[PDB]
Structures are given as structure tokens and as C-alpha cells.
Amino acid sequence: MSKITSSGVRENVHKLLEYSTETKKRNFLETVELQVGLKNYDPQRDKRFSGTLKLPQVPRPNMTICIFGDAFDVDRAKSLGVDAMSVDDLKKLNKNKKLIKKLAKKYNAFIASEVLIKQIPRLLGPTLSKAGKFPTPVSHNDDLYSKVTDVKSTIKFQLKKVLCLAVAVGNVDMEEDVLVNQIMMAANFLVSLLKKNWQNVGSLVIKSTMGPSFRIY
Amino acid sequence: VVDPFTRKDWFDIKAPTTFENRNVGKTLINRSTGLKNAADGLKGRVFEVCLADLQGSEDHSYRKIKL
RNA sequence: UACAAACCAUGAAAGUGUGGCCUAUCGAUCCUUUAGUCCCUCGGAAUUUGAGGCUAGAGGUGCCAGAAAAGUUACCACAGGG
RNA sequence: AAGACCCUGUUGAGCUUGACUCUAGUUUGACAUUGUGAAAAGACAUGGAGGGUGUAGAAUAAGUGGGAGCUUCGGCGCCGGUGAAAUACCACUACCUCUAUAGUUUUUUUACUUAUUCAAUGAAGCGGAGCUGGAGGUCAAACUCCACGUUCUAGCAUUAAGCCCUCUGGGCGAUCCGGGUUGAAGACAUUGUCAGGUGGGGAGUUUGGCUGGGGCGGCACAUCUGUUAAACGAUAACGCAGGUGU
RNA sequence: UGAUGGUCAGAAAGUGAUGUUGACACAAUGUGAUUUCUGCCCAGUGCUCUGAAUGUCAAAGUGAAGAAAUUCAACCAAGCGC
RNA sequence: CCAUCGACCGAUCCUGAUGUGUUCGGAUGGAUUUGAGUAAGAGCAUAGCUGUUGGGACCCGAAAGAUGGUGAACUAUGCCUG
RNA sequence: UGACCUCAAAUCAGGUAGGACUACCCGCUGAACUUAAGCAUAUCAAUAAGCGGAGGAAAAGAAACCAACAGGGAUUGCCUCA
Numbered sequence: 021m022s023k024i025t026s027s028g029v030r031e032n033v034h035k036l037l038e039y040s041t042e043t044k045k046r047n048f049l050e051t052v053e054l055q056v057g058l059k060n061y062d063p064q065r066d067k068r069f070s071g072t073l074k075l076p077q078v079p080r081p082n083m084t085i086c087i088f089g090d091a092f093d094v095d096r097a098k099s100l101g102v103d104a105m106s107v108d109d110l111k112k113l114n115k116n117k118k119l120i121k122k123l124a125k126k127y128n129a130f131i132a133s134e135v136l137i138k139q140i141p142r143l144l145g146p147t148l149s150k151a152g153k154f155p156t157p158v159s160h161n162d163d164l165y166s167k168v169t170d171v172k173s174t175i176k177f178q179l180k181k182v183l184c185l186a187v188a189v190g191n192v193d194m195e196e197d198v199l200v201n202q203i204m205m206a207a208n209f210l211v212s213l214l215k216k217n218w219q220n221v222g223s224l225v226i227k228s229t230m231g232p233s234f235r236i237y
Numbered sequence: 238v239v240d241p242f243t244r245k246d247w248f249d250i251k252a253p254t255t256f257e258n259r260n261v262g263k264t265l266i267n268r269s270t271g272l273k274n275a276a277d278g279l280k281g282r283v284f285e286v287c288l289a290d291l292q293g294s295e296d297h298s299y300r301k302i303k304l
Numbered sequence: 305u306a307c308a309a310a311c312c313a314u315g316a317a318a319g320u321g322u323g324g325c326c327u328a329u330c331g332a333u334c335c336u337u338u339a340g341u342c343c344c345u346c347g348g349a350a351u352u353u354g355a356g357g358c359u360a361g362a363g364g365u366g367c368c369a370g371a372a373a374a375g376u377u378a379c380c381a382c383a384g385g386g
Numbered sequence: 387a388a389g390a391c392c393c394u395g396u397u398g399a400g401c402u403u404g405a406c407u408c409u410a411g412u413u414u415g416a417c418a419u420u421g422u423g424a425a426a427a428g429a430c431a432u433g434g435a436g437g438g439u440g441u442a443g444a445a446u447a448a449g450u451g452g453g454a455g456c457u458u459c460g461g462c463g464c465c466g467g468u469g470a471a472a473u474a475c476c477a478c479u480a481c482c483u484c485u486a487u488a489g490u491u492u493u494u495u496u497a498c499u500u501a502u503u504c505a506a507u508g509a510a511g512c513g514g515a516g517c518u519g520g521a522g523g524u525c526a527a528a529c530u531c532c533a534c535g536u537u538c539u540a541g542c543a544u545u546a547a548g549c550c551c552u553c554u555g556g557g558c559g560a561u562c563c564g565g566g567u568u569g570a571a572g573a574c575a576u577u578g579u580c581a582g583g584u585g586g587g588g589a590g591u592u593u594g595g596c597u598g599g600g601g602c603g604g605c606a607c608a609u610c611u612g613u614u615a616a617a618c619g620a621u622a623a624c625g626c627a628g629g630u631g632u
Numbered sequence: 633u634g635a636u637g638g639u640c641a642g643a644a645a646g647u648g649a650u651g652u653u654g655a656c657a658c659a660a661u662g663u664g665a666u667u668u669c670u671g672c673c674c675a676g677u678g679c680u681c682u683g684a685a686u687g688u689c690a691a692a693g694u695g696a697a698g699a700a701a702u703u704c705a706a707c708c709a710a711g712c713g714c
Numbered sequence: 715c716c717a718u719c720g721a722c723c724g725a726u727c728c729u730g731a732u733g734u735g736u737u738c739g740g741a742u743g744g745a746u747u748u749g750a751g752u753a754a755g756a757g758c759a760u761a762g763c764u765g766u767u768g769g770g771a772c773c774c775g776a777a778a779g780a781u782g783g784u785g786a787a788c789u790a791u792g793c794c795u796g
Numbered sequence: 797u798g799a800c801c802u803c804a805a806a807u808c809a810g811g812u813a814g815g816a817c818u819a820c821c822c823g824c825u826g827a828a829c830u831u832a833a834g835c836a837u838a839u840c841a842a843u844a845a846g847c848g849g850a851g852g853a854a855a856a857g858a859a860a861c862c863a864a865c866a867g868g869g870a871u872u873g874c875c876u877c878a
């Protein structure tokens with residue numbers, strides 16, 4: 021049966037708010053990193069899975085971005101929008117392993133525009149992109165600041181070759197119950213991506229950049 | 238098929254002090270395993286060695302001792 | 305056996321062909337199995353398995369309108385029969 | 387004297403047997419009765435801690451979500467260079483291993499006794515230890531073993547004599563301790579329930595028809611050709627010459 | 633057939649016969665005083681004996697697939713076979 | 715009321731409109747098929763004779779089977795005492 | 797030297813059970829004749845015979861019920877369902 025314990029996660033985000041308001045800390049809020057255990061599965065043998073829905077509140081409160089290109093780009097992220105770029109290395113580079121490797125290891129997300137359909141599998145390809153890059157679906161007549169502020173809310177959940185996958189998001193600014201079930205609105209993918217769905221769960225841990233584990237599932 | 242001699246352990250035979258050349262020779266037995274020790278299945282063995290060997294002198298060539 | 309409605313073969317065609325030139329050459333109920341319709345039901349409501357129905361074959365009864373079946377009695381019994 | 391021989395009856399019985407269908411018993415397996423240890427081959431689980439590449443980073447990754455001297459210090463330092471992935475990291479998760487805690491766990495062996503099972507006695511002397519001798523040869527210091535009142539005789543042996551303390555009574559005589567009556571057997575037998583085998587010892591039933599009696603034979607029992615068949619059609623016999631299950 | 637036994641009894645039993653018994657005994661058969669002898673055959677049917685490897689092999693148990701009912705497979709006692 | 719050809723209802727087969735939870739719906743027109751039907755109700759009830767089936771079944775009749783009891787005053791065999 | 801627990805004895809003090817009847821009643825156990833034109837599952841029949849136990853009635857009885865409705869509402873019996 022589904023191991024959903026919303027009341028259990030209420031007292032657990034408080035215990036997270038303990039070591040993020042009470043107990044001891046630097047002073048303030050940080051990265052929520054509650055974990056699981058994950059058993060009853062198989063890293064090899066079967067196939068793959070993925071699932072992206074934009075989470076209720078803002079996860080990454082200081083999201084890192086690097087907008088690619090200049091064509092239909094930048095001109096939509098000037099003034100009120102920061103970041104952007106100035107191509108420059110889109111004509112040079114392409115022979116340096118770095119700079120593109122530096123761009124990936126520095127910033128946390130790029131974009132996809134309507135001209136990046138070239139650069140993602142051409143100027144990079146086996147050099148980058150497929151190594152773990154997820155271009156952002158952004159164009160002209162779109163939501164603009166709303167759909168890229170939801171990029172902070174755009175979580176992943178892909179499969180690799182390890183029985184861990186206990187990632188999390190959010191921050192401690194949230195009210196007493198703004199999380200708890202916001203995290204439960206992220207477990208839907210992790211449910212429907214495994215083979216036996218709600219069965220392939222081995223443990224569950226409440227924790228952040230701060231806690232250990234406060235007796236959960 | 239198995240070459241049963243890979244599992245043999247060699248032991249040295251020592252004669253009593255009544256004789257001179259107390260190093261009689263060597264024997265072997267199946268190596269000691271968990272079920273059967275080599276020691277218990279090895280005691281009770283009888284060795285027939287010439288008395289001339291136990292004393293060096295050939296005057297004892299016509300007597301043979303069971304140890 | 306002769307047609308009706310199909311779908312075909314053959315032949316230039318008319319035609320012929322619904323097994324063997326004709327008169328023999330074979331098989332119910334219950335059960336099982338296969339095919340068909342992919343249709344109805346499982347009765348508080350559904351999904352999927354499973355089961356049950358409807359139509360046509362097969363598995364067989366030769367004692368062939370179709371029980372499941374070894375002897376002995378000079379130890380013998382009964383109902384009868386000219 | 388409602389033939390006892392013969393035949394018929396979809397009537398029996400006694401008896402037999404690898405006829406059909408069963409069955410008491412017995413045998414074999416599984417589960418329960420059923421508990422306590424040790425060891426072997428081993429698997430697990432839990433507590434620890436610790437471990438790692440082929441290059442490049444001189445620096446041993448084995449994983450994936452992040453900032454900043456925290457531990458006095460500042461040994462090494464915290465994204466910027468070198469890698470596919472980064473040198474205090476940390477917050478914890480996840481794997482995996484090859485070391486240890488003495489955790490439960492299959493197959494084989496042998497130890498236990500309290501379940502169960504066998505036997506005896508008027509539940510009489512059990513188990514262990516200790517007194518005494520006989521020995522080992524003593525080489526420290528008395529460790530080990532044995533015995534610890536009866537054997538020429540067809541008699542007798544019963545209800546303590548004797549000693550110690552004084553307490554018409556207590557102790558020794560008659561060594562102490564454990565209240566397990568004493569052996570065998572033992573978680574195997576036995577017993578309960580299913581499962582396979584065996585089971586005329588026993589039970590129940592059956593064991594065609596036609597037919598110049600019945601039986602044996604044959605099939606005239608489902609059938610086909612010609613004739614008998616007497617010029618439509620029909621027509622019998624264990625009539626004639628023949629055929630079919632392909 | 634050496635007692636944890638053979639043969640037999642009972643629906644069962646902390647139940648019975650042999651048994652106040654122990655191979656010079658009990659139980660089961662065949663032949664049938666004495667004399668002289670009892671030949672060949674173990675292929676059949678029985679009875680009996682070993683099981684080191686081994687065809688068949690129930691329930692339980694094991695493994696796998698499935699969501700399950702279930703299905704398949706390996707192992708597999710005695711017996712049979714050898 | 716008789717013979718015959720039709721019509722309607724149900725089952726079976728064929729065709730398959732506007733439409734639509736796009737797989738449902740089934741208009742319309744047909745078919746050597748089929749029903750114990752419609753086609754201006756005829757039944758229900760009581761009684762009687764005759765006929766049927768189950769019952770003792772027109773009356774009397776087995777050899778058998780089962781259940782529960784009574785006998786070793788005869789006789790068979792063992793024991794005990796004469 | 798006194799409690800407690802368990803187990804005993806008394807012609808202790810006082811009580812209670814047994815046995816009977818058969819028509820009906822509550823259980824256990826349990827056939828076969830017969831029918832199937834034979835016969836084994838079936839049938840007779842959850843009956844006869846056997847055993848235990850009550851009463852004026854016994855038993856059952858106030859839902860772990862029936863339903864699938866617009867819902868009924870302990871048990872029992874009759875008519876019907878059939």
C-alpha cells in the first residue's frame with residue numbers, strides 16, 4: 021500500500037525546520053534534500069524512465085542559468101531579465117574541450133530557442149549535450165518569465181544505473197505546510213516510473229543540507 | 238579425471254630412541270578435512286623396516302621390525 | 305436427388321462440377337476438444353484472467369437406435385417352461 | 387413332491403481367480419506430537435568500522451543532489467587550472483566488497499533429557515564425594531587404579547548389644563552431600579491426519595444375442611450384388627454364389 | 633522368529649493368545665511306519681536378497697512466470713523396473 | 715370449417731441512414747431458414763366415466779439382501795472336578 | 797510455631813443424578829430390500845433398526861438476516877413461490 025504519510029512529513033519538515041530555524045545552523049534557509057532508499061528494482065535488465073512537471077512553489081531559490089545564443093534570444097531577456105550571452109564562442113570554440121565544458125560545469129541550465137536545434141547536436145553532440153544537458157523549451161509567443169521561473173520548479177527524475185535517486189528541491193522559506201505535500205506532488209513521477217510502481221521503495225529519509233533522518237518510512 | 242594425489246599431505250616417521258637412525262622415512266595420507274582429521278586415520282599404521290636400516294650396521298640385515 | 309443464394313474451377317462457348325459412373329463403404333444423449341460468431345452471461349457495479357452459453361466438426365459406441373463387466377458348483381436354491 | 391436332469395429368467399447363493407469396483411490390515415513419505423547443545427560445508431541478516439581506476443590531476447573512484455576555516459590552531463585548505471566525473475568537502479544517502487560482532491538459517495554427523503516409549507520393585511541402598519587398606523616408584527606430595535566384613539558342610543541369623551552427652555531422651559554403632567525409586571530408550575519410536583504402494587484376507591457386482599434343445603461352430607446382430615422372388619412393388623430360412631468397416 | 637520378535641486377536645485402548653513361554657521353543661506348511669531312494673529345469677508365476685548408480689516416481693516441499701487463481705520445471709520415499 | 719397464397723411478432727442470416735463516448739447505434743430494404751406465436755380473446759372452477767404415472771397398487775407367491783437380538787440342555791473342541 | 801495452594805478421608809451437614817413411557821420433540825449412528833426393466837454413482841434415504849436427552853409442547857428466536865427495492869426487519873406455522 022502507498023507509503024504516503026503527510027502527517028508524518030509535517031512533523032519531519034518541522035524537524036527540518038528545527039535544524040533550519042531552531043537547533044543550530046549558519047542562520048537561515050538552504051537546500052532541502054530529503055532522500056529515499058529504493059529497493060525491489062534493477063539498474064540494468066529493463067529500460068529507462070523520465071518525468072517533468074513544474075512543482076508547486078519555487079525550489080531553487082537562486083537558480084543558475086546561461087541563456088544560449090543571440091538570434092531570437094537575448095532580445096527577450098534584456099533589462100528586467102539578466103544573463104543572456106553574446107555568441108562570440110559559437111563561431112570559435114568547437115575545438116576547445118573546455119569553454120563548453122566550462123559552460124556546463126558552471127551554470128545549471130541553458131535554453132533551446134528555435135535555432136538551438138542546430139547547436140545541441142552539432143556544435144556539441146558527443147562533446148557535450150548528451151552528457152547530461154536538458155535544453156529549455158523557450159520561444160517567442162510563450163509564457164516568458166512565468167515558464168522560466170517555473171524552470172526553477174522544473175524538476176527531473178530520469179534513470180541512470182544506480183539504485184539511489186533520492187534527489188530533492190525547495191528551500192526553508194516555505195510556510196509550516198507549504199512543503200510536506202509539495203514533495204508528495206513530486207513523488208507521482210517516482211511512483212509511475214518504476215516497474216511495480218508503489219512497491220519499489222526500500223527506505224525514505226527526511227533531510228536537507230542540514231539533517232540526518234528522523235525515522236520515516 | 239581428478240588425479241587423487243593433489244590432496245595428499247606428507248608426514249615424517251620417527252622411530253624410538255632405542256635405535257640409532259631414528260628417521261625411518263615418510264608416509265602420506267588424505268589431507269585433513271573438516272569431516273575427517275588426518276591424525277586419527279593415520280594412527281595404527283604399521284611400518285616394516287629392516288633392523289639394519291635402524292642401526293646402520295648390516296649385521297641386522299636378517300631382522301625386520303614392525304613399527 | 306432437384307433447386308435457391310454465394311464463391312470458384314474448366315472450356316472458344318453452350319455448359320458441367322455441391323467428391324469417387326450408379327447401387328455398400330458407417331454412429332445419439334452426457335463429457336472433452338477444435339473452428340466460427342468475437343456475439344450473450346457469471347445475477348450489487350466494473351476491468352482483466354478463468355468459467356459458462358450459441359452454431360459446425362472431431363474423439364464411439366461393430367450387440368453397429370449406441371450397459372461399464374471373468375469363471376466354477378457332482379454342495380446347491382427359486383420362478384417357470386412340454 | 388408346484389422335476390433335483392435340460393432350457394429360459396436382464397432371479398440367487400456357496401466357492402475361485404491380475405474379471406469390474408472397492409476394502410480391514412500393513413508398508414512408504416509429509417505435517418503435527420517436538421524440545422536443548424556441538425561441528426562440518428556453507429548461505430544470509432544485523433551491528434560495526436575499513437576498501438578501492440585504465441590515462442591525465444605526481445596524488446588509487448568506486449555517485450548523483452552543494453559552499454567557504456567549521457576543528458584553538460590553520461597540517462590541508464573552500465566552485466576559477468587538470469580530467470568523462472573533483473584535492474578541507476558533509477548535509478546524508480545509495481551500491482558493492484575481502485576484516486570483525488558470536489544474530490536468526492538448509493543438508494550431514496554426534497552430544498543432552500524433560501516430551502514420548504519399554505520394564506521392575508513391598509519404589510532398598512542411585513549419583514558424587516569422602517574414610518581405610520592393596521598397588522604404581524614415590525623424586526614433592528600424594529596424582530592414578532583396585533578393593534572396601536559372607537565359599538570344604540542341606541545348621542543358626544528377626545523385634546541392637548556396646549560406647550559418648552545427660553535431656554524417662556539425643557549421637558556413634560550404620561562416613562558426608564543431592565531428596566532424580568531404579569534401569570532401558572529418546573526427540574527416534576509411538577500416536578493423529580493426508581499421500582503413494584501392497585492387500586480374494588474380506589466386500590459388492592457382473593460375467594450379450596440368435597440358434598431345428600443347449601453347448602462348440604458360424605453371424606443369417608449394422609449391411610451390399612445376383613438368384614430364391616411366383617414379369618409393378620413387397621416377401622422367410624443357420625437358402626445358393628459372393629461382398630463391406632477399406 | 634533372539635522379544636523394539638514371529639504367528640494370530642481387537643472398533644479402540646495404559647487392550648489381548650502363544651506366555652508360569654525363549655530355538656531340545658513357539659508358530660506355518662507339505663509328505664506320511666520301516667527298507668531303499670528322491671534325477672534334470674529358476675526360462676514362467678510366486679517367494680526372497682543388495683541397491684554403492686538408476687529409468688519410473690504421490691502428497692508435502694523447492695524454483696520460475698504471472699496480479700492472482702494457476703501453469704511449467706527440477707528434485708522425488710516405498711514399490712515397480714534392473 | 716377445409717385446401718391454398720399472403721401480412722404481422724420472436725429467433726437466424728444479409729444490407730447498413732441521419733448520428734457518434736469511433737465503436738456504438740440500427741433507419742431502410744430483403745432471405746428454398748426457424749417458434750409450442752398474432753391474424754376481433756376462451757378460459758377458470760366443480761363433478762362424472764374411461765386412460766396414465768408414483769404409491770403395497772387387482773389378490774396370493776421366491777431363491778435372496780439388511781438391522782437388532784436369542785441359543786454350546788444336542789453336538790464339536792479346550793479347560794476344571796468326579 | 798502459624799498462613800497459602802494443590803490433593804485426600806469421614807455412615808461428616810445438607811442435597812442432587814440414575815429408571816420408566818412413546819404419539820409428538822432435540823441430537824448421534826446408520827443399512828438393505830426396492831427403483832433405475834441388468835448394475836457400481838444415484839435411488840429407497842440423510843429413512844428402518846441401534847444409542848444419548850427433554851417437555852407440555854420441544855425446538856427456534858430478537859440478524860455477523862433477507863435483499864438490490866420507492867427497500868424489508870426475531871423465531872415458528874399455513875397458502876403460495878414450486
Ligand SMILES: [Mg+2]
Nearest residue numbers: 307320321322
Ligand atoms: Mg452450380
Ligand SMILES: [Mg+2]
Nearest residue numbers: 346347349350
Ligand atoms: Mg458484472
Ligand SMILES: [Mg+2]
Nearest residue numbers: 332361362363
Ligand atoms: Mg458427435
Ligand SMILES: [Mg+2]
Nearest residue numbers: 331362363364
Ligand atoms: Mg460423434
Ligand SMILES: [Mg+2]
Nearest residue numbers: 367368370607
Ligand atoms: Mg443391441
Ligand SMILES: [Mg+2]
Nearest residue numbers: 371373593594
Ligand atoms: Mg456386458
Ligand SMILES: [Mg+2]
Nearest residue numbers: 376377378379
Ligand atoms: Mg465332485
Ligand SMILES: [Mg+2]
Nearest residue numbers: 376377378391
Ligand atoms: Mg459336473
Ligand SMILES: [Mg+2]
Nearest residue numbers: 385386393599
Ligand atoms: Mg413340446
Ligand SMILES: [Mg+2]
Nearest residue numbers: 384385388389
Ligand atoms: Mg415346476
Ligand SMILES: [Mg+2]
Nearest residue numbers: 382388389390
Ligand atoms: Mg422346485
Ligand SMILES: [Mg+2]
Nearest residue numbers: 377378390391
Ligand atoms: Mg446341475
Ligand SMILES: [Mg+2]
Nearest residue numbers: 394395396834
Ligand atoms: Mg431378456
Ligand SMILES: [Mg+2]
Nearest residue numbers: 398399591592
Ligand atoms: Mg451374485
Ligand SMILES: [Mg+2]
Nearest residue numbers: 375376399401
Ligand atoms: Mg457367481
Ligand SMILES: [Mg+2]
Nearest residue numbers: 380381399400
Ligand atoms: Mg449356499
